[PDB]
Design an enzyme around this catalytic site. Structure first.
Site, PDB file in Angstrom:
ATOM      1  CD  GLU A  11      -2.747  -0.625   0.217  1.00  0.00           C
ATOM      2  OE1 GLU A  11      -2.396   0.286  -0.423  1.00  0.00           O
ATOM      3  OE2 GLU A  11      -3.680  -1.886   0.000  1.00  0.00           O
ATOM      4  CG  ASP A  20      -7.746   5.076  -4.883  1.00  0.00           C
ATOM      5  OD1 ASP A  20      -8.354   5.346  -5.739  1.00  0.00           O
ATOM      6  OD2 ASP A  20      -7.598   3.295  -4.837  1.00  0.00           O
TER       7      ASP A  20
HETATM    8 CO   LIG Z   1      -7.250  -0.661  -5.962  1.00  0.00          CO
END
Ligand SMILES: [Co+2]
Ligand SMILES: [Cl-]
Length: 162
Positions: A11, A20
């Site tokens: 992450e 994101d």
């Molecule tokens: Co994703």
């Protein structure tokens, strides 16, 4: 290696709010704030989760506390779900981590939905499982990460993480 190290690699760590790959606002180590288009809303979620006026910015400690909580929740989700728990119970310590990784990323619900892979993992049919898992929107939209997780399932080693 352990689940925290693993997910930190998967992450990454951002201390400022960010959109994101799907355009969702996120922060810290993969902590989703909101799926909504408003920065305002994300900002509000963030201050509520942290407990202070962050202005979209947090500390490393703050991020790690969120992460800890998030990893906790992924495990609880697993132990709570009728479909996931037996599978998790049948796996070894390395593969259990790959499973948590998935639940962290997509949720208890999302993972419970991989019926066929779940069954294959339970039966320790590793190669089949791997093939089945890759036939997914997950894999296609997160190829390298997904590949690491599948590999981990496949081999039961931490090799993909070195
Ligand atoms: Co994703
Ligand atoms: Cl929270």
């Amino acid at each position: 290696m352990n689940i925290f190290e693993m997910l930190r690699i998967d992450e990454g760590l951002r201390l400022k709010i960010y959109k994101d790959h799907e355009g969702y606002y996120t922060i810290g180590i993969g902590h989703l704030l909101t799926k909504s288009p408003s920065l305002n809303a994300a900002k509000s979620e963030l201050d509520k989760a942290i407990g202070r006026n962050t202005n979209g910015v947090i500390t490393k400690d703050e991020a790690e506390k969120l992460f800890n909580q998030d990893v906790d929740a992924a495990v609880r989700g697993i132990l709570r779900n009728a479909k996931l728990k037996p599978v998790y119970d049948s796996l070894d310590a390395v593969r259990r981590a790959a499973l948590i990784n998935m639940v962290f990323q997509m949720g208890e619900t999302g993972v419970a939905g991989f019926t066929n892979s779940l069954r294959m993992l339970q039966q320790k049919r590793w190669d089949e499982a791997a093939v089945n898992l890759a036939k997914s929107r997950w894999y296609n939209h997160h190829p390298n990460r997904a590949k690491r997780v599948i590999t981990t399932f496949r081999t039961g080693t931490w090799d993909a993480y070195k």
